[PDB]
Amino acid sequence: EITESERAYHLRKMKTRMQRVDVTGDGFISREDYELIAVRIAKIAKLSAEKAEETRQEFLRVADQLGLAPGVRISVEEAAVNATDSLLKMKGEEKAMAVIQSLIMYDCIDTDKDGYVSLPEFKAFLQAVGPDLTDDKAITCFNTLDFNKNGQISRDEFLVTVNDFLFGLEETALANAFYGDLVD
Secondary structure, three states, X not given: OOOHHHHHHHHHHHHHHHHOOOOOOOOEEEHHHHHHHHXXXXXXXXXXXXHHHHHHHHHXXXXXXXXXXXXXXXXXXXXXXXXXXXXXXXXXXXXXXXXXXXXXXXXXXXXXXXXEEEHHHHHHHHHHHOOOOOHHHHHHHHXXXXXXXXXXEEHHHHHHHHHHHHHOOOOOHHHHHHOOOOOO
């Protein structure tokens, strides 16, 4: 049984994630706000029409889980609850499907398609999805996710962080860094 403090921490993580969707900072998000992220992803990666649409479709699939139904506008904390409720219910192969979105993003960073990403690659991608993010924030994020301190992050290393952020009930440095400083 998930404890009150584990639920508190997971929701805190999810609210931090959802606040990234809230591009005007009004405390509310919608389906098209989520699609905007996929559009920014396609632009920086220079995705083909087909790959760009696959990226959009995956974001829409996740939007459904987040309660970002067509036409609705919901609070960042309501979306966070939907995220926590959905993610913590998942078992086995469901959890593999849950990281597909992040693996699509990793491919977009990984310009050589070799299963490694450098700081320049990572920073360019992160500041495209989040142009409000300072160089300090982007580089801090890279440095932490580079947990083996090789100056590059492997696909498997990235997946460790994604899993810990999405499913972790206990606090870690990686989960505390993936979406920047966690929000109240």
